[PDB]
Subunit: 244 residues, 6 copies
């Protein structure tokens, strides 16, 4: 398959216009997209060790969820120099689907919603991020699902008692900012996401919002694996994962 055909396939599943404003999605590093592709590698992060592993495994197309850079640069030294050197010497294409993969149907957030069998799920934010709906069961039933399918030991901020058939909000990745806690506290009883910090925990306790941190890594990798299997079933391509 040609690189531009892989890119079109991905953009059919997760359209570029779904990405929130300023999100650096699409081609990160690459020249010729008529290049033919024998081995695609998928990763959560375009980290130095992921890129080293890609070179070692003979990956020619590297797909990551997070962009290579959020902040623009005009100098090439240290780590970014090492990364680009490996990608350019091996002519490895680096392509990213970030918030457009979180938001799209059957994307990262939908995967979580599907896992918890959320009743009548709606988007958590107006831009499309996250899902919220009724969880048909008890809080403990919700915890056992999280522990078995997402993360063995989630941090639970038990701000209040939770009744059965509660409102559950999910957001894969970093959803536990202070501003998110205040917003979601008005929309849900329980909030499942990643990257909890001190001030957010205090805030969650004050608002009576139950927060479950199943980590940034695990809440995205769950959906990313399903996406990887989707790629495998539909492309006549060797596909491997590098950091999950």
């Amino acid at each position: 398959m040609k690189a531009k055909e892989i890119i079109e396939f991905i953009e059919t599943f997760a359209p570029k216009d779904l990405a929130i404003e300023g999100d650096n999605i699409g081609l990160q590093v690459g020249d010729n997209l008529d290049k033919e592709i024998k081995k695609l590698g998928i990763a959560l992060d375009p980290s130095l060790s992921v890129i080293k592993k890609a070179e070692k495994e003979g990956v020619d197309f590297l797909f990551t969820h997070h962009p290579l850079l959020k902040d623009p640069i005009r100098n090439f030294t240290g780590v970014i120099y090492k990364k680009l050197k490996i990608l350019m010497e091996n002519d490895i294409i680096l392509y990213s689907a970030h918030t457009n993969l979180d938001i799209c149907k059957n994307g990262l957030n939908d995967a979580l919603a599907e896992l918890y069998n959320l009743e009548n799920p709606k988007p958590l934010y107006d831009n499309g991020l996250g899902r919220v709906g009724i969880f048909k069961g008890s809080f403990e039933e919700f915890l056992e699902i999280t522990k078995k399918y997402i993360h063995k030991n989630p941090i639970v901020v038990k701000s209040k008692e939770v009744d059965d058939n509660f409102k559950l909000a999910v957001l894969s990745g970093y959803g536990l900012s202070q501003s998110s806690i205040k917003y979601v506290a008005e929309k849900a009883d329980v909030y499942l996401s990643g990257d909890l910090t001190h001030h957010s925990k205090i805030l969650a306790e004050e608002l009576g919002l139950v927060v479950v941190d199943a980590t940034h890594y695990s809440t995205e990798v769950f959906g990313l694996k399903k996406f990887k299997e989707f790629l495998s079933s539909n492309l006549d391509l060797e596909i491997i994962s590098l950091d999950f």
Copy 2:
């Protein structure tokens, strides 16, 4: 003692001009500073449950490390309504020493520097946040000191092997931001602070900086306990802690 006498004592120990710019230090909520003070309460956070406890324990002067508000507001509803209502009905004075207490001599960062017996301690930043110096011993010894005195199960990002007599940087509270990691990576082998997130962990691994997250809470409470003993020994005032 009168409230203004307590404040002057605190500002002698931690001068207001030491605070980094835009830090909301000083009087948070207050009326008459000629008021005489029955009970001084010290807390990390001016949280709802802390302020409730202050009211219940008869605290009239509430000292917190974190300010009540970082972002200004023009509406008084929900949680902030509940907090202000308690402080004003009981005429409880709320006063904060934030980064000025982090930076001053024998402050929150110096306490950490003394604990690890840093050789030739220097300020980590030019504004004077954090401390940096040589730890005279092994990484495992460093860990057991951390585990016994700060936090029992710190998260360790072991990006590289660390030699004996390595450079240790310490920062009480939230010091594990992405920009901090890139800055400290140029100055230390090991970085001890709080509030780790995914992107920070990945970045530390790429730069080979060993990060130890002993939590935001514990890295500040350690110095705060020391400050509490300092106040008790010098003032003729009943002094209690509310969230530690």
Copy 3:
């Protein structure tokens, strides 16, 4: 009746979406809106003496035209401390309808337009503020209506002679800014509003726009009284005015 029922009634009459950009309308100070309301107080300003008077008269719901704060704050001392203390210990709800009450049908600007019986009244600004139309009569007749119903001694900047059946623009409150003078000069012969200042007077004279300052207070209180009687006729509630 409940506070939320009063708020619903007010927002039916003056919907919040009519409010101009950045206008601080709605709930100013308050927590529980299921609270029941025995006595509603209406005022132009949430001033210190108004709030003391509300407390003295046993007002539990205080409605004001101007918001409590335009500039946001993060510290609570002095005058604002006194205001909140009185509202919170007595659990008095403070609620505001500002520009949404100026713009709505039968609102503050419509009340003035109806008084002068403007022929074919149009909004003065595109956002909804002010009214403009033909006054069917002489300038002297317009002055007598002003003197009898709005303000006994208005300041008149007679920049030019005014013919019968002239175009009259009205704007309740502060409409005599320099920018307004230049805008209205293109739309009307006579401009009736409040809060005239030196530079604005000069500008009106240069442009030949006749400006009548019947004061900020009086141009809003006229419509506010009408609103008060509307509330009285429709709610089974004791209603008093506090600064008019």
Copy 4:
């Protein structure tokens, strides 16, 4: 009585009120004019560079028009309407328009000092760090202060009597527009009584809450008092015909 070059008039004015005294962004100095070697037979002084002041300057044969307020505060890139009418008159008649604004407010014996001397303020200090306004003790009763205001500044001042004021009170003066909400909050911590101009509703309410006594003797009159003194200074020192246009 003789003629003077425009640049000599400007040098004299800037000696009395140096330009670096002006606060940030204040549009002081030459407003309209090209050649400063121009000879000047008649100097005109005004508070405002208004249309009617400029018409009067043309009618009276003024060659050099001095105003306290600048022609423009906000820059423009189109020349129509009133600004067109003003520039046409200034340019057709080759009239130089020059302004000393906050530098005239702040300088020694300037507009604010004129008020401080009028009320014989004890130990006068600048009200702001930029040097606007004056503050000191008025040695007498509030009633005496009011009669001075009424006799020398304005006959019917607006008084916001927020509290009773004792004899020998602290008085702040600010010529022109000093009654903004932020000024009221600042001066409330420095004085019992605040004398200035351009009172508005929200400011009055704010003064009442803070217990600051505010006296509005108008923007016009509080500057014109000092401007008349400035005109007299010019008349006695320059051998030039000097007239006032809006006072």
Copy 5:
């Protein structure tokens, strides 16, 4: 004819809403638009020498393509004083149609597009600046048309060989900015415009875009002459050009 009738005629041909954002079009200098106009002067620039010539020729209405000022001023000295003095003393109206004249049908860009007989011309930018389409002929033929009708000695940046029937973009005026070069390189083989500079030339060479600089002046004057002839055929007015 009255000045307002001339203005209406021009705005019918080139509506002001076509002008790009922030473009200072319309009346530059003038008060009364009922003035009678015997002689219209048309110029590219409202320069000092053009304005002197307008006065010398008894021009009553001066139409320029470029505005008098792009950046606003609050002081009137030097050149702008001299320009305004001549315009106001001699009662000359100055009016400009800038980018609305570039963009409109049969405007400056359409004039260039028709000259080179572009097949299926489309606007180059989304705001409607420039034209792009296929030039039916060889590069040498394109070049000889340029030399005969626009400028005898254009600067040619021959970054690549050009095939017959190539894509030609034209932009009258300043179209050779670095940003434009990067944008047009994706849309055309050859770019005709004005005001080439060093960094733009280098960039054109790197991208393989052939750039032809026929100067800012000539690429606009070509269309301006066509517009002048249009005014002559339709208005019963004496019409002269001042800088072409």
Copy 6:
């Protein structure tokens, strides 16, 4: 003739043109490179880090590429097209790219000084406060000045002859792009004749209105003149093969 480590080359260059001399936001110093202990046998010097310069560097075995202009002024977060092609060549060949931009314009014996010495300006002073360019009196006629320009800089400069120029006039020089509209308004008050590069239409008109004589000897030639002098400076002091790539 021997090899040098990259850091030794950088140290020599920064002694001649210290980095703190660079104006605000100027992207000077290391552009592309990781290890500065790298050994350098061949130094390449260029005006622009263009694609064709970088291709030529690769072909000539350049290990250290010095350019006057930075690789990027505007930061980027995607690597495609031309920048991809440039970095690929630099990274594959382990070529260090380093730049001295305005710090080379401003330092003593830099690009602007080279021009000032060339025209033998009497009492040369910095043109700007930062301080780009030089200004002083040219001891001679305009025709003599024009012939020096034609001899050393560019045979065919564009001359905007806004006025007649008397002998012993004030000459301003600025290497590179100095003919912006704002520069012209500034220089018009400081000199009779302005020598620089990159003239555009609006700038030409503006110079004609202000009576400032502008001579465009191109952006390229006015910088290459001083760059050649810098290249010879490096040759005499470093035992390295040094070649130029776009001049």
